[PDB]
Design a protein around this nucleic acid. Sequence first.
RNA 1: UAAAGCUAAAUAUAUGUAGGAGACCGAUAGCAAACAAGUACCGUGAGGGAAAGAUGAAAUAGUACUCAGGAAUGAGCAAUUAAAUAGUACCUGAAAUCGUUAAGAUGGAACGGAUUAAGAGAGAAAACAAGUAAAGAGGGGAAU
RNA 2: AUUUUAAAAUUAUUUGAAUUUUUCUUCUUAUAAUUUAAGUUGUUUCUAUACAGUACUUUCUUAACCCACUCGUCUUGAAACACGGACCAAGGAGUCUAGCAAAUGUGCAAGUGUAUAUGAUUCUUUAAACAUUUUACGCAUAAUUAAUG
RNA 3: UUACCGAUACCAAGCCAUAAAAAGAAGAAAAAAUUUUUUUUUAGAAUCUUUUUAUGAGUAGAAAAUCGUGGGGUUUGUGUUGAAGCGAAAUACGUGAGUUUUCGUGGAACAUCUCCCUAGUGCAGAUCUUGGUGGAAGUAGCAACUAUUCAAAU
RNA 4: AGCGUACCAACAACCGCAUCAGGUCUCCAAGGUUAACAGCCUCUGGUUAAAUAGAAAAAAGUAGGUAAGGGAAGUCGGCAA
RNA 5: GUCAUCUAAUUAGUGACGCGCAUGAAUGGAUUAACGAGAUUCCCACUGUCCCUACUUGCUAUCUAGCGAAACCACAGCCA
RNA 6: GCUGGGUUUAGACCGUCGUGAGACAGGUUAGUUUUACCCUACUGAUGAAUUUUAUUAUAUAUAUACAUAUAGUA
RNA 7: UUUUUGUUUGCUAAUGUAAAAGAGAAAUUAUAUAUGUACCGGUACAUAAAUAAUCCUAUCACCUUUUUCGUGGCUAGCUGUGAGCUAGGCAAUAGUUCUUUAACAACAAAAAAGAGCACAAACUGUAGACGACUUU
Lengths: 170, 125
Amino acid sequence: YAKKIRNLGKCAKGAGVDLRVHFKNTYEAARAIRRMKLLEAKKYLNDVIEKKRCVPFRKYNGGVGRTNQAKEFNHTQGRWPAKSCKFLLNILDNVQANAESRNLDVSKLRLIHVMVNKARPGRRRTYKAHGRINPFMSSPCHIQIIAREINISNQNRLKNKSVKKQQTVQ
Amino acid sequence: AVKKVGKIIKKRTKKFTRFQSNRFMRVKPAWRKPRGIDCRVRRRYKGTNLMPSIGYGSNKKTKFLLPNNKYKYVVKNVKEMEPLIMNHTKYCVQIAHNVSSKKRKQIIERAKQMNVSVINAKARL
RNA sequence: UAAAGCUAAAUAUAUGUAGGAGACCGAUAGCAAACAAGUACCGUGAGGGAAAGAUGAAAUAGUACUCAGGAAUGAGCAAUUAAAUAGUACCUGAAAUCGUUAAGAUGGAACGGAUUAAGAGAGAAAACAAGUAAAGAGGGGAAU
RNA sequence: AUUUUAAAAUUAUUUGAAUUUUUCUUCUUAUAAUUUAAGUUGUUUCUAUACAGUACUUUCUUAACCCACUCGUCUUGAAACACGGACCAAGGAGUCUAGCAAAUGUGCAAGUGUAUAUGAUUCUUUAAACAUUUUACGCAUAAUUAAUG
RNA sequence: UUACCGAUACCAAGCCAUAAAAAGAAGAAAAAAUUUUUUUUUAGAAUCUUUUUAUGAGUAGAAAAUCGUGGGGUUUGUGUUGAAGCGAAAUACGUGAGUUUUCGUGGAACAUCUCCCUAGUGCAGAUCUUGGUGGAAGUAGCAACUAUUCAAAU
RNA sequence: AGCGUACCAACAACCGCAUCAGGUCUCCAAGGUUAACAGCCUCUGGUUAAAUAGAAAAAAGUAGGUAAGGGAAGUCGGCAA
RNA sequence: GUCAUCUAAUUAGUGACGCGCAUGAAUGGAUUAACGAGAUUCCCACUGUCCCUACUUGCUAUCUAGCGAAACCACAGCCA
RNA sequence: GCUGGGUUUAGACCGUCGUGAGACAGGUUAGUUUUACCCUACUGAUGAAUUUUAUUAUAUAUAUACAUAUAGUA
RNA sequence: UUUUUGUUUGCUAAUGUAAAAGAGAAAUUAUAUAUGUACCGGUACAUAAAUAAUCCUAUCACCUUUUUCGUGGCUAGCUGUGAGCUAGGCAAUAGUUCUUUAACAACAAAAAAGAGCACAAACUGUAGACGACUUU
Ligand SMILES: O[C@H](c1cc(C(F)(F)F)nc2c(C(F)(F)F)cccc12)[C@@H]1CCCCN1
Ligand SMILES: [Mg+2]
Ligand SMILES: [Mg+2]
Ligand SMILES: [Mg+2]
Ligand SMILES: [Mg+2]
Ligand SMILES: [Mg+2]
Ligand SMILES: [Mg+2]
Ligand SMILES: [Mg+2]
Ligand SMILES: [Mg+2]
Ligand SMILES: [Mg+2]
Ligand SMILES: [Mg+2]
Ligand SMILES: [Mg+2]
Ligand SMILES: [Mg+2]
Ligand SMILES: [Mg+2]
Ligand SMILES: [Mg+2]
Ligand SMILES: [Mg+2]
Ligand SMILES: [Mg+2]
Ligand SMILES: [Mg+2]
Ligand SMILES: [Mg+2]
Ligand SMILES: [Mg+2]
Ligand SMILES: [Mg+2]
Ligand SMILES: [Mg+2]
Ligand SMILES: [Mg+2]
Ligand SMILES: [Mg+2]
Ligand SMILES: [Mg+2]
Ligand SMILES: [Mg+2]
Ligand SMILES: [Mg+2]
Ligand SMILES: [Mg+2]
Ligand SMILES: [Mg+2]
Ligand SMILES: [Mg+2]
Ligand SMILES: [Mg+2]
Ligand SMILES: [Mg+2]
Ligand SMILES: [Mg+2]
Ligand SMILES: [Mg+2]
Ligand SMILES: [Mg+2]
Ligand SMILES: [Mg+2]
Ligand SMILES: [Mg+2]
Ligand SMILES: [Mg+2]
Ligand SMILES: [Mg+2]
């Protein structure tokens, strides 16, 4: 994992190797999640899956609509990336399980590192124009998630000068 | 600008970076001299990168002296250390980057015996 | 001494096989082909014609087991190894590109040069202290 | 390590002159010193009674003042409303031989080059190195003429 | 009528290179200590050293000095107490190509500047080749064939 | 005697670089309306699928409709309807 | 091109005229019923062609879930 | 943005010119009008942020910029 | 509001100033004249006329003794602050400068004292591509 941890005893990690979900949506979801208690994050994910709360598309915001729920994050654009959300939820669950297996309280766990890297594209073919074959590739991803339990010089002359200054002030 | 320290004068502390090395990744900073019409650098327009030139060179007398005032000498072995027994105030040892730790230590020890300065004693320390 | 003929040797070999070589090439190089290459695949056909090597000393060390998972996978207080960010897409793993974190900047570009500045890192081999003394740890060389 | 000397100048002396009678009057006889000669040395701090700090060095970072137009390219002229360039990595272009030339190096020199080829007590390297029979040929040493010459 | 500001031009000084010119095959100086120790040097590399003066634009081009890469002969070395490489650097050196070093990775080779020998020897461009990767962009779009819906099962 | 005998025949099995609205030969051929193997609807057989669904129902587009009074005054031209 | 004709008006159309830059006889000339997805003009019918646009329907566009390209691109992107 | 009637591709006809292929700044007819999803511009549609920033006064005739100002909604 | 110390896992104590060294200064108005003042724009009398070439405000530390006057508080006295007068003779020494650490504003901690909205969701349709708006 990418993060500098020091003590892995208070941390619980979870990974997703090559996910069949779009890199951008998933990234957005991750961003939305970040710096949150694990349970709260899970709840948020659930809500998004049921189309109650949206994730704000702030980075990859090209063409994404203009939802009502985006006002919650001071933004205008937002979406409900279902499959991606589900994937993320699964990973969260895994992380939770891992934590349980150790000795970490799930209530005091915060997501300290939610990384989404883009995996190698799954190549497919699309057919265009005047007999033209074009790449119809997917954008798979790796997801890395880390949860964590959260609760000169003197100089004599210089000294003299300082003293003088003090005296002056007085 | 100019960087006087002792009698040691350095005319140009800044590196001369290649033209446009800051504009395209593919172009490294390593100085290359621009050729061809319409260079701007070649033509020396105000505001562009400067062209390294012989005027910049350091006085023949202090040239390869480092801040210490000693010419740096690279050392791979004790035998090599030895040419500088009669020169401890004028050349300073640097131990080769590829020397194994024991050998380095030995070299350092030798240097101390000789009173010769080591500029990189701390490698693998 | 024509209008009949034969005849070994030296001489030539980018073909084939078999040897031996190099101041040769080192996987975009070298044969097209270091690998199930004239193979896959394309062309009605004559023809055209690739890409693709490397884990480790040893897989007779190729991931046991536990937990979460529909499963993949993940995680481990677990496990092979010297080493798994050597996990079979496996040596090294650059750049473009992208992610996380931090710092900073931001009124229709950005970067840059010249000169400072404030930060933020780095550093002591010029950037102070030779020697003298008390006593430890070492190393030597010589004299007889 | 003798032009950081010699002289100039200046200071305190010493002998003789001068018309500019003058505590900087000049020459000159002699001796010491000094610097106005003969390119900056001294005093006191500070860093500092420090081993790296917030000081000092330097890399990066933005600022800020002033400046700064996309490079390559063909062109009288490119920032061009000229073309090529999305980006990056690797590959990617005056070479090799034949004969001639001048340049220069080297050996030999009216010669020179041992060509093929032979010979060896030569055989991992040895496809090189060595050796050249107990008037070869090249180029040069002579030119000139269509030509017998 | 002055005064002032104002160039890479001019002047004064330094330093760098180039060109030329002078010229060159033996010796103790000082300081610190306390008369003797300690601290520095004690030079002589002919394309070299010392000094002097003048000069320094530059495309096409020419030349010289360097620098680096793959291999060779020679030379003296570095490696599992970790080589090459790679990434970041560095009170680093060089005008500069670069060189050298530190940390991290790496896990096996690597140099030569001692001389010179050889080359398939240096890239930002060629609508360059090959392989990769972007912004465009989570956008265009996934609109012929009249049309689906409910319940259950897996 | 031997050989062929599955299945597809395009709707995704063929050729169109593809599970591409294209192309590709032949036979069988129901009721109604009707001149009609036309078109429209139905029975037998076959599907209810087609590189997507859902929600909204702006502009704009595209395939359509319909427009008072006028009737080519539009436009190169009654093109289109 | 002049006279007619068609129109409220005609560089069009038709019928004449003809010293015709440069028409003309199988380079076929002149005339022709029928035929033509032929070229041209006028008339009637008919209409959103137009006056003068309006409303409306499917399918797209639109938003969502899912998936998901490309051309192009020196860097980029306000003007006088 | 359209239209494509002409001009200015290939088909074709006539006239003149050319031995001819063909020529015509002579005539006549038939002849594919591709792409916005980029940036800006414009038209509309949301919408944060804004202390070296503000202030035409405030306060009980006197004061005070050597001063006020939070913010969030509406 | 006052005081104290500080600002020498991504965090969980916290710093920034285009400008402090006295950053001192409120008639108005004309420019071939103004300003006051007193009467009825007019008259008379003053006044500025190098107007910031000025004026104001600085340094009197100390504590104690003899006080005087002003201002602010509470029920003539008391206390605090500012200014003068009189007496006591008292203090600062950093070894020659290296900013004269002296301002403003924000904070953070410590003690002390006092005292609900909005979005969504459903609904709406005066709105509308989606937001947004209009509603409930
Ligand atoms: O020219 C002399 C000299 C002599 C000799 C010697 F005679 F020994 F061969 N050799 C010299 C050399 C040398 F030849 F290399 F030995 C160089 C320079 C000077 C040399 C110098 C004179 C100055 C002192 C050094 N030797
Ligand atoms: Mg030019
Ligand atoms: Mg140019
Ligand atoms: Mg024969
Ligand atoms: Mg190959
Ligand atoms: Mg080891
Ligand atoms: Mg590794
Ligand atoms: Mg290996
Ligand atoms: Mg690897
Ligand atoms: Mg400018
Ligand atoms: Mg031109
Ligand atoms: Mg061209
Ligand atoms: Mg281009
Ligand atoms: Mg290219
Ligand atoms: Mg290359
Ligand atoms: Mg010659
Ligand atoms: Mg020059
Ligand atoms: Mg190397
Ligand atoms: Mg080459
Ligand atoms: Mg390149
Ligand atoms: Mg080039
Ligand atoms: Mg390519
Ligand atoms: Mg059958
Ligand atoms: Mg069957
Ligand atoms: Mg089909
Ligand atoms: Mg085919
Ligand atoms: Mg289909
Ligand atoms: Mg009508
Ligand atoms: Mg009518
Ligand atoms: Mg008309
Ligand atoms: Mg009209
Ligand atoms: Mg029609
Ligand atoms: Mg008409
Ligand atoms: Mg007629
Ligand atoms: Mg004729
Ligand atoms: Mg016909
Ligand atoms: Mg692309
Ligand atoms: Mg046309
Ligand atoms: Mg034609």
